[PDB]
RNA sequence: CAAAUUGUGCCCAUCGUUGGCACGCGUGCUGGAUUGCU
DNA sequence: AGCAATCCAGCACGCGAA
């Protein structure tokens, strides 16, 4: 029985200066009262002590010491009342409190790093005594009241809802103090302030409790018997990480070094004579060169191992073994990581004041039916583009409540649930008058006017479905400055069902046109593959393409990648003519009439970045170009950009260009603060902010649109077959230090988990759908519907191509794959066996195939493709599409007989999507 | 309780043919990544 | 090393009722 919430981010319309100021005063009164509740509950939590929690004592694994520590020892900003405690003196302070010494959990909690510059530990027990003294209440009575609170779940862990706390709760003195500090007791305002004060309290408390649990569990996984070895290895300063020595290649490096050392030792033992020092120096130089070459080789696929660390380890080769060295270094890295995990501070939340109907600040959108009643009782057009919400505002001047009306202007909200049926869908056909009105609106209001008129026409034509209002919408009024941002939240109920019938996987690639693929559960037709025991059938499989209808064409935002420059010729010609004045194969290599516009823009950004690096002293002179390249120009990043990964790469290189521009314009040593660069060129900083906001909007739109396409396909399959299952990838632990910096940057824009969260949220809104995450391990190579049934297949990937388009790089890669060399990667073995199968298919005589004269090889391939009546030839490729699948899983796959199997050349992405599906289908369907 | 001029936005070589399209908002802290000159 | 920013993700609660 799952549920979620929707929100339409309405916009407040000023009703009148007096009413607006009244609402602002009410908001300020509520906001200023929240910190009082925050401090009061800080004191209450500080008051906790043993003999109070020793009642029900209900808790999973939380030790009483950890609970007490969190209840009276928290990290808060330096500038706050409870100041006066240092980290060192935590153990004795806890010992004094409750009369017991710290335990492991409490010691770890106290032994938790934080940011001393901004935050600091706070006693949270002198605050309780301060509350007792200032309000002069007996400690016994306060203890009784707070024990009652805890018995009511009003303090500690797992607090009850704020409204319940306020309703349930020496009460006279507490209420008098609240009245002195906060306004008169009113349930709504008190509940709102208590909620907005407790939120950070309980949130950070639970987060830090689970953080301590994780830290103790991680430390229990630390061996600690390498601690002397850790100190030996550790003997400016930085932590040592496993990637600094080639975590896995260090064993081979040390084996080679041990062999060389054995040779050196046996040669020194014999041939005992002078000049030994020269040979030893020659031995040291050779080992140093070997270490450097090893680091150079290892730095091609990961971070380059540190040369100095390896030299230090090799010098101490007799005092520690290779496995001991690895254990010590991993122990040091793990200890450093565990000891830098900050504890979560407790900052004060900015109140939001959720206005509702049941138990919140009373308020409501009036109704559509009551809106019609109001428009009929009072002469009105009966149709308007605004929503009136009645809010029970507390008058600051006269301390009494009063209901006022305020206007919201969200067209989407009207389109979705508000506008009435007086008389996912499409759009109606407008009349003459409505079209004239749309054409008469100003340029900036044309789109919203068009939407409003289309909605009005839909109402006129009975094309607006009845929306069963229900009146269960929550209003969230947040006052930041002098303006409001009402939201109009709403609940959505799903009642999820487990009896699925389809599995709709999607690979969510980065740069290879993320695709989807569906699989039936109990198919009964021509093709029913018995995977293990469940009859399944490939339903279909296609790419996630979003259609933007230009005047006559239809572009794909996710993959358009820009125009091909065949129509942007004047811009490129002007840029070339201007640049010719100052001194070009690279320029022409990117200016082809088939090159995409965004690729050209990215390459130009990188070229300008390099030039500015070269011409560091004159970075300002190019600033105009940057503007003409990013905002002002018609062919600019802000004016023209798609959602394809190439576009995000272009934006990232633009941000890097701005960064290097600031660095070169502000270099002659105090740090270059953002303020200094802003003052040096406020226009450039404003442009950078504009790019950042544009990219944030760009990424949110991409997540939204991809989620829309996949969820719409899921809905289609549900309409056809039944409850669908998406099974999206669990892209976790990505962007590791072990990977190269370029790889980390490339994976950052993956947005795989963002898309997964968005589609999960959407699926929470549609009945029947559900989204689960499965392990992406080996999902990119398994052959669909045949892997795992007899056993794992793990076939390799190819790339079909004609002989005429064969390149030297392809031949070199193929020959390298043909090289029978031992490799630890299972992918290398898979590609080796695939290449062996390819050779056996046509008998290329690998020994005779690795010769020169690539033209001769092309001629031989053409002869082979002539003997066998085909069109192209396949060849293994590590980054190639066209995975070999046994079934026709594409609908465009080509049947080809490889050996005796009659495979279907599908596309790698579609088979990957299929693999992502049915990974744990048995878990989905139990025999019950 | 009347402003009837804007929810956030997204797409484009010819910004309109009424162009096409999407969307949970906030707050808070915690982990990985973007230049720069030795 | 002789130090300025920001983005991508991860969890904590409001969006109870009777």
């Amino acid at each position: 029985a799952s549920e979620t919430r929707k929100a339409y981010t309405t916009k407040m319309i000023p009703r009148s200066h007096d009413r607006m100021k009244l609402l602002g005063n009410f908001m300020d009164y509520l906001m200023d009262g929240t910190p009082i509740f925050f401090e009061l509950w800080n004191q209450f939590g500080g008051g906790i002590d043993r003999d109070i929690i020793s009642g029900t004592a209900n808790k999973d694994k939380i030790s009483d010491d950890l609970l007490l520590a969190v209840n009276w020892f928290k990290v808060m900003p330096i500038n706050s009342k409870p100041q006066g405690v240092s980290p060192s003196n935590l153990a004795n302070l806890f010992q004094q409190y409750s009369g017991s010494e710290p335990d492991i959990q409490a010691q770890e909690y106290f032994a938790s790093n934080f940011d001393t510059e901004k935050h600091q530990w706070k006693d949270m027990r002198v605050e309780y005594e301060r509350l007792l003294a200032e309000l002069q209440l007996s400690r016994s009575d306060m203890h009784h009241d707070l024990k009652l609170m805890y018995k009511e779940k009003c303090i500690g862990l797992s607090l009850s809802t704020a409204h319940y706390i306020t309703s349930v709760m020496c009460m006279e003195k507490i209420k008098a103090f609240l009245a002195s500090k906060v306004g008169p007791y009113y349930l709504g305002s008190y509940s709102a302030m208590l909620e907005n004060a407790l939120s950070p309290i309980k949130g950070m408390t639970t987060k830090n409790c689970k953080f301590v649990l994780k830290q103790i569990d991680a430390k229990n996984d630390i061996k600690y018997e390498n601690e002397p070895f850790g100190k030996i290895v550790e003997g400016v300063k930085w932590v040592l990480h496993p990637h600094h020595i080639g975590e896995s290649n260090i064993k081979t490096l040390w084996e080679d070094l041990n062999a060389i050392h054995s040779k050196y030792e046996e040669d020194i033992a014999s041939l005992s004579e002078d000049k030994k020092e020269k040979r030893i120096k020659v031995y040291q130089g050779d080992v140093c060169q070997t270490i450097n070459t090893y680091c150079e080789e290892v730095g091609k696929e990961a971070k380059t191992p540190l040369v100095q660390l390896l030299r230090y380890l090799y010098s101490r080769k007799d005092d520690i073994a290779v496995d001991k060295i690895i254990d010590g270094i991993t122990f040091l890295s793990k200890k450093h990581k565990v000891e830098k995990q900050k504890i979560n501070p407790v900052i004060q939340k900015y109140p939001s004041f959720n206005f509702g109907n049941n138990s919140k600040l009373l308020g409501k959108i009036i109704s559509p039916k009551d809106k019609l009643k109001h428009n009929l009782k009072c002469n009105r057009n009966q149709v308007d583009n605004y929503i009136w919400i009645e809010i029970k505002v507390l008058n600051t001047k006269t301390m009494r409540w009063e209901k006022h009306h305020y206007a919201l202007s969200s067209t989407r909200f009207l389109e979705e649930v508000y506008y009435p049926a007086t008389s996912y869908e499409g759009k109606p056909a407008l009349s003459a008058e409505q079209i004239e009105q749309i054409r008469s609106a100003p340029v900036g209001l044309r789109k919203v006017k068009k939407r409003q008129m289309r909605l009005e026409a839909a109402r006129q034509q009975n094309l607006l479905p009845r929306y069963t209002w229900g009146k269960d919408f929550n209003i969230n009024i947040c006052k930041r400055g002098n303006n409001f941002e009402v939201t109009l939240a709403t609940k959505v109920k799903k009642k999820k069902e487990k009896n699925y019938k389809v599995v709709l996987g999607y690979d969510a690639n980065i740069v290879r046109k993320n695709t989807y693929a569906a699989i039936e559960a109990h198919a009964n037709g021509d093709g029913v593959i018995d995977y293990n025991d469940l009859p399944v059938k490939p339903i279909e499989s296609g790419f996630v393409t979003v259609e933007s209808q230009v005047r006559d064409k239809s572009y794909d935002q996710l993959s358009y990648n820009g125009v091909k420059l065949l129509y942007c010729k004047p811009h490129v010609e002007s840029r070339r003519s201007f640049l010719e004045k100052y001194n070009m194969k690279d320029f022409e290599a990117i200016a082809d009439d088939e090159t995409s516009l965004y690729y050209f823009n990215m390459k130009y950004c990188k070229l300008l970045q390099s030039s500015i690096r070269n011409h560091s002293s004159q970075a300002k002179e190019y600033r105009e170009e940057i503007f003409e390249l990013l905002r002002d120009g018609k062919l600019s990043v802000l004016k023209l950009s798609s959602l394809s990964n190439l576009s995000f790469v272009m934006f990232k290189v633009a941000k890097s260009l701005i960064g290097t521009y600031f660095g070169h314009l502000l270099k002659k040593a105090p740090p270059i603060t953002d303020e200094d660069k802003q003052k040096a060129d406020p226009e450039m900083f404003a442009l950078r902010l504009a790019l950042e906001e544009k990219r944030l909007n760009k990424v949110k739109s991409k997540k939204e649109v991809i989620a829309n396409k996949i969820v719409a396909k899921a809905l289609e399959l549900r309409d056809k077959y039944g409850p669908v299952l998406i099974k999206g990838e669990n892209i976790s632990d990505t962007t590791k230090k072990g990977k190269k910096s370029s790889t980390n940057s490339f994976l950052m824009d993956w947005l795989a988990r963002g898309v997964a969260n968005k589609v999960k949220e959407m699926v929470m809104m549609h009945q029947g759908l559900e989204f689960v995450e499965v392990n992406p391990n080996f999902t990119s190579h398994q052959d669909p519907f045949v892997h795992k049934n007899p056993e794992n297949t793990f076939r390799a990937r190819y790339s079909r191509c004609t002989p005429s388009e064969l390149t030297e790089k392809n031949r070199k890669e193929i020959l390298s794959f043909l090289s029978d060399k031992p490799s630890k990667r299972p992918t290398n073995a898979y590609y080796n066996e695939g290449a062996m199968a390819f050779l056996a298919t046509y008998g290329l005589k690998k020994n005779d195939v690795l010769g020169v004269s690539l033209e001769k090889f092309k001629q031989i391939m053409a002869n082979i493709l002539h003997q066998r009546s085909e069109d192209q030839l396949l060849f293994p490729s590590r980054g190639g599409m066209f995975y070999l699948a046994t079934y026709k899983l594409d609908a465009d796959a080509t049947s080809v007989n490889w050996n005796g199997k009659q495979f279907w050349v599908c596309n790698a992405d579609l088979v990957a999507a299929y693999n992502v599906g049915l990974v744990d289908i048995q878990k989905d369907f139990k025999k019950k």
Side-chain angles (χ1 to χ4, degrees), chain A residues 5 195 202 207 210 354 358 360 491 671 674 695 751 753 757:
Chain A
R5 287 100 169 189
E195 162 184 331
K202 63 193 300 186
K207 189 177 174 55
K210 290 196 181 184
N354 297 266
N358 178 270
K360 301 157 252 173
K491 273 188 171 184
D674 69 330
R695 191 191 155 284
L751 312 172
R753 286 306 313 269
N757 288 338

Coordinates of all heavy atoms in Angstrom, one line a residue, chain A residues 5 195 202 207 210 354 358 360 491 671 674 695 751 753 757, chain C residues 1-10 12-17:
Chain A
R5 N 3.2 12.0 -3.3 CA 2.6 13.3 -3.4 C 3.1 14.0 -4.6 O 4.2 13.9 -5.0 CB 2.9 14.1 -2.1 CG 2.2 13.7 -0.9 CD 3.0 12.8 0.1 NE 2.4 12.6 1.4 CZ 3.0 12.0 2.4 NH1 4.3 11.6 2.3 NH2 2.4 11.9 3.5
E195 N 6.6 21.6 14.1 CA 7.0 20.7 13.0 C 8.3 21.2 12.4 O 9.2 20.5 12.2 CB 5.9 20.6 11.9 CG 6.3 20.1 10.6 CD 5.2 20.2 9.6 OE1 4.0 20.1 10.0 OE2 5.4 20.4 8.4
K202 N 14.9 15.7 14.7 CA 14.7 14.3 14.6 C 15.5 13.8 13.3 O 16.0 12.7 13.4 CB 13.2 13.9 14.5 CG 12.5 14.5 13.4 CD 11.0 14.3 13.5 CE 10.6 12.9 13.7 NZ 9.1 12.7 13.7
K207 N 19.7 10.4 11.5 CA 20.8 10.2 10.5 C 22.2 10.0 11.2 O 22.9 9.1 10.8 CB 20.9 11.5 9.7 CG 21.9 11.4 8.5 CD 21.9 12.6 7.6 CE 23.0 12.5 6.6 NZ 22.9 11.3 5.7
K210 N 22.2 6.4 12.7 CA 22.6 5.4 11.7 C 24.0 5.6 11.3 O 24.7 4.6 10.9 CB 21.6 5.4 10.5 CG 20.2 4.9 10.9 CD 19.4 4.7 9.7 CE 18.0 4.2 10.0 NZ 17.2 3.8 8.8
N354 N 3.1 24.3 6.0 CA 2.2 23.6 5.1 C 0.7 23.8 5.6 O 0.3 23.4 6.7 CB 2.5 22.1 5.3 CG 3.8 21.7 4.7 OD1 4.0 21.3 3.6 ND2 4.9 21.8 5.6
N358 N -7.1 19.2 7.6 CA -7.4 18.3 8.6 C -6.8 18.7 10.0 O -7.6 18.9 10.9 CB -6.9 16.9 8.3 CG -7.2 15.9 9.4 OD1 -6.3 15.7 10.3 ND2 -8.3 15.2 9.3
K360 N -3.7 21.0 10.1 CA -2.7 22.0 9.8 C -3.3 23.3 9.9 O -4.5 23.4 10.2 CB -2.1 21.6 8.4 CG -1.5 20.2 8.3 CD -1.5 19.9 6.8 CE -2.5 18.8 6.5 NZ -2.6 18.5 5.1
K491 N -2.0 14.4 -2.3 CA -1.6 13.0 -2.1 C -2.0 12.1 -3.3 O -2.9 12.4 -4.1 CB -2.3 12.4 -0.9 CG -1.6 12.6 0.4 CD -2.3 11.9 1.6 CE -1.4 11.9 2.8 NZ -2.1 11.1 3.9
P671 N 43.6 33.5 -1.6 CA 42.8 32.8 -2.6 C 41.9 33.7 -3.4 O 41.5 34.7 -2.9 CB 42.0 31.8 -1.7 CG 41.9 32.6 -0.4 CD 43.2 33.3 -0.2
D674 N 35.2 34.0 -4.9 CA 34.2 34.2 -5.9 C 33.9 35.7 -6.0 O 33.6 36.2 -7.1 CB 32.9 33.5 -5.6 CG 32.2 34.0 -4.4 OD1 32.9 34.5 -3.4 OD2 30.9 33.9 -4.3
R695 N 22.0 24.7 -17.3 CA 22.3 23.3 -17.3 C 21.5 22.6 -16.2 O 21.1 21.4 -16.4 CB 23.8 23.2 -17.0 CG 24.3 21.7 -17.2 CD 25.7 21.6 -16.7 NE 26.0 20.2 -16.3 CZ 25.5 19.6 -15.2 NH1 24.8 20.3 -14.4 NH2 25.8 18.3 -15.0
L751 N 23.6 10.3 -15.0 CA 22.2 10.7 -14.6 C 21.4 9.4 -14.6 O 20.2 9.4 -14.7 CB 21.6 11.7 -15.5 CG 22.5 12.9 -15.8 CD1 21.9 13.8 -16.8 CD2 22.7 13.7 -14.5
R753 N 21.1 7.2 -11.9 CA 20.3 7.2 -10.6 C 19.3 8.3 -10.6 O 18.2 8.1 -10.0 CB 21.2 7.2 -9.4 CG 22.0 6.0 -9.2 CD 21.2 4.7 -9.0 NE 20.0 5.0 -8.2 CZ 20.0 4.7 -6.9 NH1 21.1 4.2 -6.2 NH2 18.9 4.9 -6.1
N757 N 15.4 7.4 -9.9 CA 14.6 8.0 -8.9 C 13.3 8.7 -9.6 O 12.2 8.5 -9.0 CB 15.4 9.0 -8.1 CG 16.3 8.4 -7.2 OD1 16.2 7.2 -6.8 ND2 17.4 9.1 -6.8
Chain C
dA1 P 46.9 21.0 -0.4 OP1 46.8 20.9 -1.9 OP2 46.3 22.2 0.3 O5' 48.5 20.9 0.0 C5' 49.4 20.6 -1.0 C4' 50.8 20.6 -0.5 O4' 51.7 19.7 -1.3 C3' 51.5 21.9 -0.5 O3' 52.5 22.0 0.6 C2' 52.2 22.0 -1.8 C1' 52.4 20.5 -2.2 N9 51.9 20.2 -3.6 C8 50.6 20.2 -4.0 N7 50.5 19.9 -5.3 C5 51.8 19.6 -5.7 C6 52.4 19.2 -6.9 N6 51.7 19.0 -8.0 N1 53.7 19.1 -7.0 C2 54.5 19.3 -5.9 N3 54.0 19.7 -4.7 C4 52.7 19.8 -4.7
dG2 P 52.4 23.2 1.7 OP1 53.6 23.1 2.5 OP2 51.1 23.0 2.4 O5' 52.3 24.5 0.8 C5' 52.5 25.8 1.5 C4' 51.9 26.9 0.6 O4' 52.7 27.0 -0.6 C3' 50.5 26.7 0.2 O3' 49.6 27.3 1.2 C2' 50.4 27.5 -1.1 C1' 51.9 27.4 -1.7 N9 52.0 26.5 -2.8 C8 52.2 25.1 -2.7 N7 52.4 24.6 -3.9 C5 52.2 25.6 -4.8 C6 52.2 25.6 -6.2 O6 52.4 24.6 -7.0 N1 52.1 26.9 -6.7 C2 51.9 28.0 -6.0 N2 51.7 29.2 -6.7 N3 51.8 28.0 -4.7 C4 52.0 26.8 -4.1
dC3 P 48.3 26.5 1.7 OP1 48.0 26.9 3.1 OP2 48.5 25.0 1.4 O5' 47.1 27.0 0.8 C5' 45.8 26.8 1.1 C4' 44.8 27.7 0.4 O4' 45.1 27.7 -1.0 C3' 43.4 27.5 0.5 O3' 42.6 28.7 0.5 C2' 43.0 26.6 -0.6 C1' 44.0 27.0 -1.7 N1 44.6 25.9 -2.5 C2 44.2 25.7 -3.8 O2 43.3 26.5 -4.3 N3 44.7 24.7 -4.6 C4 45.6 23.9 -4.1 N4 46.1 22.9 -4.8 C5 46.1 24.1 -2.7 C6 45.6 25.1 -2.0
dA4 P 41.0 28.7 0.7 OP1 40.7 29.5 2.0 OP2 40.5 27.3 0.7 O5' 40.5 29.5 -0.5 C5' 39.1 29.6 -0.8 C4' 38.8 30.0 -2.2 O4' 39.7 29.4 -3.1 C3' 37.4 29.7 -2.7 O3' 36.5 30.8 -2.4 C2' 37.6 29.6 -4.2 C1' 39.1 29.2 -4.3 N9 39.3 27.8 -4.7 C8 39.6 26.7 -3.8 N7 39.7 25.6 -4.4 C5 39.5 25.9 -5.8 C6 39.5 25.1 -6.9 N6 39.8 23.7 -6.9 N1 39.3 25.7 -8.1 C2 39.1 27.0 -8.1 N3 39.1 27.8 -7.1 C4 39.3 27.2 -5.9
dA5 P 35.0 30.5 -1.9 OP1 34.1 31.4 -2.5 OP2 35.1 30.4 -0.4 O5' 34.8 29.0 -2.4 C5' 33.4 28.5 -2.6 C4' 33.1 28.6 -4.1 O4' 34.3 28.3 -4.9 C3' 32.1 27.5 -4.6 O3' 30.8 28.0 -4.6 C2' 32.7 27.1 -5.9 C1' 34.2 27.3 -5.8 N9 34.9 26.1 -5.3 C8 35.7 26.1 -4.2 N7 36.3 24.9 -3.9 C5 35.7 24.1 -4.9 C6 35.9 22.7 -5.3 N6 36.7 21.9 -4.6 N1 35.2 22.3 -6.3 C2 34.4 23.1 -7.0 N3 34.2 24.4 -6.8 C4 34.9 24.8 -5.8
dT6 P 30.4 29.1 -5.8 OP1 31.6 29.8 -6.2 OP2 29.2 29.8 -5.3 O5' 29.9 28.1 -7.0 C5' 28.8 27.2 -6.8 C4' 29.1 25.9 -7.5 O4' 30.3 25.3 -6.9 C3' 28.1 24.8 -7.2 O3' 27.1 24.8 -8.3 C2' 28.9 23.5 -7.2 C1' 30.3 24.0 -7.1 N1 31.1 23.3 -6.0 C2 31.5 22.0 -6.2 O2 31.3 21.3 -7.2 N3 32.2 21.5 -5.1 C4 32.5 22.1 -3.9 O4 33.2 21.5 -3.1 C5 32.1 23.5 -3.8 C7 32.4 24.2 -2.6 C6 31.4 24.0 -4.9
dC7 P 25.9 23.9 -8.3 OP1 24.9 24.4 -9.3 OP2 25.5 23.7 -6.9 O5' 26.4 22.5 -8.8 C5' 27.0 22.4 -10.1 C4' 27.2 20.9 -10.5 O4' 28.1 20.3 -9.6 C3' 25.9 20.1 -10.4 O3' 25.8 19.1 -11.4 C2' 26.0 19.5 -9.0 C1' 27.5 19.2 -8.9 N1 28.0 19.1 -7.5 C2 28.2 17.9 -6.9 O2 28.0 16.8 -7.6 N3 28.7 17.8 -5.7 C4 29.0 19.0 -5.0 N4 29.5 18.9 -3.8 C5 28.8 20.2 -5.6 C6 28.3 20.3 -6.9
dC8 P 24.5 18.2 -11.6 OP1 24.0 18.5 -13.0 OP2 23.6 18.4 -10.4 O5' 25.1 16.7 -11.5 C5' 26.1 16.4 -10.6 C4' 26.1 14.9 -10.2 O4' 26.6 14.7 -8.9 C3' 24.7 14.3 -10.2 O3' 24.7 13.0 -10.7 C2' 24.3 14.4 -8.7 C1' 25.7 14.2 -8.0 N1 25.8 14.9 -6.7 C2 26.3 14.3 -5.6 O2 26.7 13.1 -5.7 N3 26.4 14.9 -4.4 C4 26.0 16.2 -4.3 N4 26.1 16.8 -3.1 C5 25.5 16.9 -5.4 C6 25.4 16.2 -6.6
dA9 P 23.5 12.0 -10.5 OP1 23.4 11.0 -11.5 OP2 22.3 12.8 -10.2 O5' 23.9 11.3 -9.1 C5' 22.8 10.7 -8.3 C4' 23.4 10.4 -6.9 O4' 23.9 11.6 -6.3 C3' 22.4 9.8 -5.9 O3' 22.5 8.4 -5.8 C2' 22.7 10.5 -4.6 C1' 23.9 11.4 -4.9 N9 23.8 12.7 -4.3 C8 23.3 13.9 -4.9 N7 23.3 14.9 -4.1 C5 23.7 14.4 -2.9 C6 24.0 15.0 -1.6 N6 23.7 16.3 -1.3 N1 24.4 14.2 -0.6 C2 24.6 12.9 -0.9 N3 24.5 12.3 -2.0 C4 24.0 13.1 -3.0
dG10 P 21.4 7.6 -5.1 OP1 21.7 6.1 -5.2 OP2 20.1 8.1 -5.5 O5' 21.6 7.9 -3.5 C5' 22.8 7.5 -2.9 C4' 22.8 8.0 -1.4 O4' 22.9 9.4 -1.4 C3' 21.5 7.6 -0.6 O3' 21.8 6.5 0.3 C2' 21.1 8.9 0.1 C1' 22.2 9.8 -0.2 N9 21.8 11.2 -0.4 C8 21.6 11.8 -1.6 N7 21.2 13.1 -1.5 C5 21.2 13.3 -0.1 C6 20.9 14.5 0.6 O6 20.5 15.6 0.2 N1 21.0 14.2 2.0 C2 21.4 13.1 2.6 N2 21.4 13.1 3.9 N3 21.7 12.0 1.9 C4 21.6 12.2 0.6
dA12 P 17.1 7.3 6.9 OP1 17.5 6.0 7.6 OP2 15.8 7.4 6.1 O5' 17.2 8.5 7.9 C5' 17.3 9.8 7.5 C4' 16.4 10.7 8.2 O4' 16.4 12.0 7.6 C3' 14.9 10.3 8.2 O3' 14.4 10.3 9.6 C2' 14.2 11.3 7.3 C1' 15.1 12.5 7.5 N9 15.0 13.5 6.5 C8 15.5 13.4 5.2 N7 15.2 14.5 4.4 C5 14.5 15.3 5.3 C6 13.9 16.6 5.1 N6 13.9 17.3 4.0 N1 13.2 17.1 6.2 C2 13.2 16.4 7.3 N3 13.7 15.2 7.6 C4 14.3 14.7 6.5
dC13 P 12.9 10.1 9.9 OP1 12.7 9.5 11.2 OP2 12.3 9.3 8.7 O5' 12.3 11.6 9.8 C5' 10.9 11.8 9.9 C4' 10.6 13.3 9.8 O4' 11.4 13.9 8.7 C3' 9.1 13.6 9.5 O3' 8.7 14.7 10.2 C2' 9.1 13.8 8.0 C1' 10.5 14.4 7.7 N1 11.1 14.2 6.4 C2 11.0 15.2 5.4 O2 10.4 16.3 5.7 N3 11.5 15.0 4.2 C4 12.0 13.8 3.9 N4 12.5 13.6 2.6 C5 12.1 12.8 4.8 C6 11.6 13.0 6.1
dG14 P 7.2 14.8 10.8 OP1 7.2 15.9 11.8 OP2 6.9 13.4 11.2 O5' 6.3 15.1 9.5 C5' 6.6 16.3 8.7 C4' 5.4 17.0 8.3 O4' 5.7 18.0 7.3 C3' 4.2 16.2 7.8 O3' 3.0 16.7 8.2 C2' 4.4 16.2 6.3 C1' 5.2 17.5 6.0 N9 6.3 17.4 5.1 C8 7.5 17.0 5.3 N7 8.3 17.0 4.3 C5 7.5 17.5 3.3 C6 7.7 17.7 1.9 O6 8.8 17.5 1.3 N1 6.6 18.2 1.2 C2 5.4 18.5 1.8 N2 4.5 18.9 1.0 N3 5.1 18.2 3.1 C4 6.2 17.8 3.7
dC15 P 1.7 15.7 8.1 OP1 0.6 16.4 8.9 OP2 2.1 14.3 8.4 O5' 1.3 15.8 6.6 C5' 0.8 17.0 6.0 C4' 0.5 16.8 4.5 O4' 1.8 17.1 3.8 C3' 0.2 15.4 4.0 O3' -1.3 15.2 4.2 C2' 0.6 15.4 2.6 C1' 1.7 16.5 2.5 N1 3.1 15.9 2.2 C2 3.6 16.0 1.0 O2 3.0 16.6 0.1 N3 4.9 15.5 0.7 C4 5.5 14.9 1.7 N4 6.7 14.4 1.4 C5 5.0 14.7 3.0 C6 3.8 15.3 3.2
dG16 P -1.9 14.7 5.5 OP1 -3.1 13.9 5.2 OP2 -2.0 15.8 6.5 O5' -0.8 13.7 6.1 C5' -1.0 13.1 7.4 C4' -2.1 12.0 7.3 O4' -1.8 11.0 8.3 C3' -3.5 12.5 7.7 O3' -4.4 12.1 6.7 C2' -3.8 11.9 9.1 C1' -2.9 10.7 9.0 N9 -2.6 10.2 10.4 C8 -2.0 10.9 11.4 N7 -1.8 10.2 12.5 C5 -2.2 8.9 12.1 C6 -2.2 7.7 12.9 O6 -1.8 7.5 14.0 N1 -2.7 6.6 12.1 C2 -3.2 6.7 10.8 N2 -3.6 5.6 10.3 N3 -3.2 7.8 10.1 C4 -2.7 8.9 10.8
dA17 P -6.0 12.5 6.8 OP1 -6.5 12.3 5.4 OP2 -6.0 13.9 7.3 O5' -6.6 11.6 7.8 C5' -6.5 10.1 7.7 C4' -7.1 9.4 8.9 O4' -6.5 9.9 10.1 C3' -8.6 9.6 9.0 O3' -9.3 8.3 9.0 C2' -8.8 10.2 10.4 C1' -7.5 9.9 11.1 N9 -7.1 10.8 12.1 C8 -7.0 12.2 12.0 N7 -6.7 12.8 13.2 C5 -6.6 11.7 14.1 C6 -6.2 11.7 15.4 N6 -5.9 12.8 16.1 N1 -6.2 10.5 16.0 C2 -6.5 9.4 15.3 N3 -6.9 9.3 14.0 C4 -6.9 10.5 13.5

